[PDB]
Symmetry: C6
Subunit: 219 residues, 6 copies
């Protein structure tokens, strides 16, 4: 990653064994559970494109997902090259060349080039641009691997309302519902999918009920 | 988080794998036991709003709780915007814009904006303001998930008084009794809920008994 | 805690996940075994009152003990306020206010106030004063939870003398015998409580015997 | 490894116990799974030739692989000496000698010589040159230890298409297919090797199908 | 402990959770095996008397040993006070007082006094003096807890000579034989205590045999 | 160990709990497997003679080996004293004395003397000289504890050639064959010791076969 030292210069530091192991272990334990993505984002704080490729490449399983992710990165790289075409022919001696999509993705750029871009005044944030592409790809993977439609999350007859709501919102998160839909589902599908006893209690609360109020009501 | 370096400047540092893992593991092991909240506060020392969202978003279960927490944050954001309305229209070039509730909560502000506020002379402490909102939300969750009324904590006939007192005060903590009530319960409900043999001994001590004296008495 | 940096200034640093976890785990594993107290003291090296409250508040069990500890802290705070009454009415602008007992205990003081006191020339050591109160409280808890009187530690007929002496001094430590009594018990209760075969051997050594000499004698 | 300090000088630092243990443990757990190679590359960030030999030499098993790796290094060293012959006879007093292949590989050079080369202005990057040779050798080992031809990865009749695609691309990675072949296999061998029900669905999609679209289709 | 910072000043740093836990765990796992003493010495590198008392006091078991250790420390403190008597009556204002035996042992001195002594030009090395006393005490404990005389370590009839030699020298180490005796036992008791078949082979080697040669001979 | 600080001075730092524990654990898990020696070398990076004795002394088992190691160190110390005799009689006031073999081995020198030598301009590298002696001793131990002659490593009739080659080269490493012999064994003993089916295939390859080619051939 790129970090600041005591002279006030942002400098390269090696990715730590602790970071490398944390990422491989969260993928081993959680696969493409939605909460893996904020973990990836946080473990890749300050990452160069080299560091992002290290993290993705240290994953041993899930090679279907990793091939889909490469396809997404290639789509984003291709859109970058459409928006930001680069001069053909020789670099000005000693000067910074403009990054292409494959430079951002770390496959045609050196670590030295990456550092040069990320530490330019002002930064050309190739690490942050590439991380955006990767997270776009990972979100597609999370949606693909979501096992269950929200339509099939219904409260069991002896299922505590809290356990049902946990399943419901775990499902909406993987299915990648907007916050607007998560906020609004409280006075639609969450009530419809409740068991008869709880649905009667929720129906009676009226509209405008907070989730806290609905959970209190069906305790 | 924001930390101080050797030039005397408060600077951004990445959230550590150790911090990320500590928080996910305490939620896995303890759920919304009351002691999770001081742990959250301490693990989020120096946190930006980005870091607070990372910690909450890395939680995989408990999505009912996480949706209630978003509802609380939205209520606090809305009260902030009532107290501190911001100018519409263009930012003064190169100058700091005033934060809105959604900027404090990290959903409409950049990490660079957050750093700018938190390191301003004097600080606009968006991390501390947002942490207050989050802890307000988490305290509601702790109360909601408290399984047992204090009225139902009664000393078993062969239950050591110490084990009963541990249950009693564990319950009052989750039910979120004020310190005044915790202090005063020693000469009310704690005696009433004691078994006959201990209640007789405590009744005789008189008023003014310390908890230490009551625990000694029923040893 | 408060630590020194490279300019020679004592500065605040966040409590570490390693410290937080060490303390919660020693309380989980050892409860109020006497050796928990030196561990608390060492894990709280440099602690602000905020940090001491974090450590105590991260404990999930033992709420009888934690309520007794609050009662002790309140007694010490009340004695502080007797010795060191503070001016009522407005703070001199920009100047340091004098701490009250509740400021020392971290319930009515800010982290900024605490730092101000602890880093004043010369320090007003609110962290060390509060730690003294807490350790006074924890020592009461250790004594309360000591399960066995020293009168009931007697050497079994096939019990190795060393195993008996370990039980004896483990008991005296929890019962909170002075060093004078621990030193002097070697030529009283330790011999009286020994089995017949060892008591005969120890009786014959004469007075003045070192513990090493008594342990050699009954090997 | 070579790291930068506060004066702006790249300096030697000891290889950490954490790095040493991480590498030995990944070889113990994963052997020559392809993902071991990016892990080796990342754990050896900044490595001197001495550090690379330490990492390889701390491996206890797999001595067939380690002997093949030495053979590869010797081939690369021999090609280096062809491209970059060095002066015979005495070093200019106090001056830097040119590295030979065995100096790059750390067997005939001192740590001091290695540091001298790696910190020269401009660097003679003996650590990076040697790491290239080692990774060339390790890639041969990965290919040798790949247990299964891609021709024998075929979707079972009740095998979820995703599990088949994971096996397929895990196999292509170990067999060390180019990215061009991995990209193009989606509209050849991946369909041919699918079960009848999925092959019918994929045959119908037409050409141009993304992996995401094929995986959606056979969900 | 006392460590050096960047201004070139030896400064106090808190004992680390890692150090505290390492020591408690080695005593839990190894008790008073001789190898515990070099571990104590190394874990207490740079220790103040306060830090040495922390380490000893964090031990929960072995209170017979810990009482013997206090007796040894008191003997050494008493000899210090014989060699180095201190002036009675008032300290020169702002000046360093001379340490007494109980100051060296940390029971009558403050951490500030200890730092003052250890960082004086030239140091009054109270940490190193106290560590010497403690190690003297711990060596007595190791000897006391040694279970077996060297006279009773004899090679079994089907016992590999190497396993016998390991037992022999493990025993001599706990019994606290000088290096002179360990060196010389190779051509006395080690041969006498060998089984008949090995004793015949060793008898024939002649005098002057290295341990390596004796171990080769009886392989 | 000796490390560099920010003023550009090589300074003493305490051996870390992580280093101490890593070494004791590798000896517990691997004994005198050959790969323990590069691990010792790497864990002792920068070590003073004091640190090397700490590491060897923290080993609890293997006291036959540790006594042989002392014998080797004494032989090397004696050869040092032959090559580098030191002046008898008084040190020049305030000046550096020349090290004797026992000073290099840390038994008659202080840590301060060791630091003085290792940080002299130019260094008298007592840590590196002593580490050489120790590794010479440890290599003898590895050879002594090697359980099996290379003559007895023969490919089983259903043993995969790769598993046989792993045994063969694991054995040559412990028996401490030169690299020349390891390189040349590929076209001698490795073929002779192969099973009939593989020997026929290898016999036919001709001379000049790489290990990779032989392993491919007998796959
Ligand atoms: O190296 C890796 N692992 C996952 C993605 N990448 C970068 C990449 C992107 C696109 C095609 C090929 C390689
Ligand atoms: O990102 C997260 N996780 C939990 C809360 N937040 C911030 C937030 C607040 C309110 C609505 C939407 C998002
Ligand atoms: O916060 C905590 N946990 C244990 C003690 N304290 C401080 C305190 C002291 C007294 C009353 C109320 C609170
Ligand atoms: O020391 C090691 N372990 C694996 C490779 N190397 C360096 C080397 C290269 C070639 C021949 C001999 C030694
Ligand atoms: O505090 C501890 N634990 C073990 C020794 N010490 C210091 C000490 C020495 C002698 C008498 C009393 C106390
Ligand atoms: O202290 C230790 N442990 C193993 C070797 N050494 C140093 C030494 C060398 C020779 C004789 C005596 C002691």
């Amino acid at each position: 990653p790129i970090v600041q030292n005591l002279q006030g210069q942002m400098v390269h530091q090696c990715i730590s064994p602790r970071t490398l192991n944390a990422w491989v272990k969260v993928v081993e334990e959680k696969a493409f559970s939605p909460e893996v993505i904020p973990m990836f984002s946080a473990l890749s704080c300050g990452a160069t494109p080299q560091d992002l490729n290290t993290m993705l490449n240290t994953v041993g399983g899930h090679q279907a997902a990793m091939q889909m992710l490469k396809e997404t990165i290639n789509e984003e790289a291709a859109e970058w090259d459409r928006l930001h075409p680069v001069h053909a022919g020789p670099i000005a001696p000693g000067q910074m060349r403009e990054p292409r999509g494959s430079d951002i993705a770390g496959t045609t750029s050196t670590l030295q080039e990456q550092i040069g871009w990320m530490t330019h005044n002002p930064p050309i944030p190739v690490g942050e641009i590439y991380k955006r592409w990767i997270i776009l790809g990972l979100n597609k993977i999370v949606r693909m691997y979501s096992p269950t439609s929200i339509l099939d999350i219904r409260q069991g007859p002896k299922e505590p309302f809290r356990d049902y709501v946990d399943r419901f919102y775990k499902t909406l998160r993987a299915e990648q519902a907007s916050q607007e839909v998560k906020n609004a589902a409280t006075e639609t599908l969450l009530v419809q999918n409740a068991n008869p006893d709880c649905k009667t209690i929720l129906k009676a609360l009226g509209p405008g009920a907070t989730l806290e109020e609905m959970m209190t009501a069906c305790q």
